[PDB]
Amino acid sequence: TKPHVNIGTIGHVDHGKTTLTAAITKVLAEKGQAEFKAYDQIDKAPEEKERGITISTAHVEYETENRHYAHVDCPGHADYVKNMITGAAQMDGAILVVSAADGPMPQTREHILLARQVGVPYIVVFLNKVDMVDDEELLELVEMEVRELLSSYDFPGDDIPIIKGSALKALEGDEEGEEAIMKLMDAVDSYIPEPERAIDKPFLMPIEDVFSIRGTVVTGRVERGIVKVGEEVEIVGIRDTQKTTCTGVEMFRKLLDEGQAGDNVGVLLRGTKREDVERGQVLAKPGSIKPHTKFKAEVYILTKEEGGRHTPFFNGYRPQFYFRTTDVTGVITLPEGVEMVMPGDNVTITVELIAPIAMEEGLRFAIREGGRTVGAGVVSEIIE
Numbered sequence: 001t002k003p004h005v006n007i008g009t010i011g012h013v014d015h016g017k018t019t020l021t022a023a024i025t026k027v028l029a030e031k032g033q034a035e036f037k038a039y040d041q042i043d044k045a046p047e048e049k050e051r052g053i054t055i056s057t058a059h060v061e062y063e064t065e066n067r068h069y070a071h072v073d074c075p076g077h078a079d080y081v082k083n084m085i086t087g088a089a090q091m092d093g094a095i096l097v098v099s100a101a102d103g104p105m106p107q108t109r110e111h112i113l114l115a116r117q118v119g120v121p122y123i124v125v126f127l128n129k130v131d132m133v134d135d136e137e138l139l140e141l142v143e144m145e146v147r148e149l150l151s152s153y154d155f156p157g158d159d160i161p162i163i164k165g166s167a168l169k170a171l172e173g174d175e176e177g178e179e180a181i182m183k184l185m186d187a188v189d190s191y192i193p194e195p196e197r198a199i200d201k202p203f204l205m206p207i208e209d210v211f212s213i214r215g216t217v218v219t220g221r222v223e224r225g226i227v228k229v230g231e232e233v234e235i236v237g238i239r240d241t242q243k244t245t246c247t248g249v250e251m252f253r254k255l256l257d258e259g260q261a262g263d264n265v266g267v268l269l270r271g272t273k274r275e276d277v278e279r280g281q282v283l284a285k286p287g288s289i290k291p292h293t294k295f296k297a298e299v300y301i302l303t304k305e306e307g308g309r310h311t312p313f314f315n316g317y318r319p320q321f322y323f324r325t326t327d328v329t330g331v332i333t334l335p336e337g338v339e340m341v342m343p344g345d346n347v348t349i350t351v352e353l354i355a356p357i358a359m360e361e362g363l364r365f366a367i368r369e370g371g372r373t374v375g376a377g378v379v380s381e382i383i384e
Ligand SMILES: Nc1nc2c(ncn2[C@@H]2O[C@H](COP(=O)(O)OP(=O)(O)O)[C@@H](O)[C@H]2O)c(=O)[nH]1
Pocket: 011, 012, 013, 014, 015, 016, 017, 018, 019, 020, 043, 075, 097, 128, 129, 130, 131, 132, 165, 166, 167, 168, 169
């Protein structure tokens, strides 16, 4: 019944991300809309090893009167870099926690930057520890700096909701703290939009295999949107884009009239040659996506223990980039002042592939070396 939304607390270590998370569950639990999770339950988040990468993440759920939320909170900076780049925890919005006494700190800056690189749509701020600041004019100045920092990374710093409170007071049952928590959740309900359904997006299916029996059939999972018998589709990319019509959709022993987000199907293509279709291309609504060879991306480089490299790479490093279904070789260019990239670092890079790929901001990929994963990335900018 209630719409679902995924959010999380970001911010510098020790500014109160975990205390605020606990306070949210406590106050909403007091309204009969969540189970209360204490500070220690959340601070001691379990390790989850997906694909060699190990990440500590606390998962709580709670509801307002309008929505149902899934909430992620992580102990260490490194955990946020990982989750945000790999996508192990998506965020329809983020709650930025900033200590009112200390103000923005390096990881406050980095999480805003990451939030923009990976496409976190919108941010709300909880300006925490107001009980340690006794001067109103000091409070306004720190709020002012936060809005500038947000705007310096293209978020609407002038329009973002910033709620001032004390998560620890709220957790002690203080009435003024609890009101701050509800001001925060009222802003989350109002300012963070509900995510677009996958089935409502323009059709896109990555091609995993190609067959010629009836004619040419391609198999894969429909990533988003719907494809119906009789509709036109474009084939992107690697080669010049081309257009055809869907004449059939099917599973095991089951013909279909349509294929929609989440379905594993085979799609009949009319008059398309098998040699003109190959793994790595995608089917898509005509005009909805384009092929590109060059782009910028935010990447996380796996550590030795995570199965990655154990030596840095330098400008001109030439690995394979795994987009959806296959590798494509590309050359890496490093930022202006960056000289090397150590295992475990995150950095923004420019890449030029040797072949085009259907590409768009927010597309995730792996970096591979010798058939081994060495990095994970997110396309942050297209370069034509
Ligand atoms: N005085 C005060 N201390 C707080 C507040 N919120 C959190 N703290 C303290 O700040 C320290 C770190 O808080 P924590 O939530 O673990 O920060 P995190 O690293 O972002 O998760 C703890 O000792 C908390 O008790 C607050 O509103 N006021």
